[PDB]
């Protein structure tokens, strides 16, 4: 929650959780930034 | 909670009929509309220190006046016309 609060009110930055990835939010964004704790927790859930 | 004879008598009537009765020592008061002639006679003999011969009362309905938000009825009064004793002190109603 230290970095979640840091990028709330930037225009264009949308924040979601690893278990809340969905097609409408990936395709709206030109760039997808994973936290390294969040990218491993997405790969280890889909093997 | 105690009473007062000045709670019955509200105000005097100021009109060119009531000025014509001041010459004969006859006074016109607006009284509270739930008061009989004996309350009014005990009160005038205790407020002004005078002797009262007779009290004549007259209810009057309120006027109803046209207004753009509808009709509206005014307040309903009770006059009481007080005749003093033959030869007592006149009441100074301050004008």
């Amino acid at each position: 929650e230290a970095g979640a609060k840091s990028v709330r009110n930037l225009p264009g930055v949308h924040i979601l959780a690893p278990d809340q990835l969905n097609t409408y939010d990936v395709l709206r964004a030109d760039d997808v930034v994973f936290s390294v704790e969040a990218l491993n927790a997405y790969i280890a859930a889909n093997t | 909670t105690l009473a007062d004879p000045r709670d019955i008598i509200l105000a005097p009537v100021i009109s060119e009929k009531s000025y014509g009765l001041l010459d004969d020592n006859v006074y016109t008061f607006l009284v509270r509309p739930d008061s009989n002639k004996t309350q009014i006679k005990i009160a005038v003999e205790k407020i002004f220190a005078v002797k009262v011969a007779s009290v004549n009362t007259a209810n009057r309905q309120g006027k109803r006046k046209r207004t753009r938000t509808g009709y509206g009825k005014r307040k309903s009064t009770k006059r009481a016309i007080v005749t003093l004793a033959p030869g007592s002190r006149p009441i100074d109603l301050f004008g």
Binding site: - | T1, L2, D4, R6, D7, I9, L10, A11, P12, V13, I14, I47, L93, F94, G95
Partner: protein
């Protein structure tokens, strides 16, 4: 008249401050009818101080802040 200065009056000075303040309203109701009252804010003032005296006399027979 402040409420703080009506509380040192004992038990029957309030009954004769109530009595000489209903005469003050009575003389002011005659001056409004005859049109000889310039200060018309004094009708509102005397009605409040009659109302303020009944509050002090009622508290003393309800057991709230008694004392001469």
């Amino acid at each position: 008249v402040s409420p703080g200065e009506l509380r040192e009056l004992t038990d029957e000075e309030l009954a004769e401050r109530l009595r000489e303040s209903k005469e003050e309203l009575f003389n002011l109701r005659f001056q409004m009818a005859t049109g000889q009252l310039n200060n018309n804010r004094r009708l509102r003032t005397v009605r409040q101080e009659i109302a303020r005296i009944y509050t002090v006399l009622r508290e003393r027979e309800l057991g709230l802040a008694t004392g001469p």
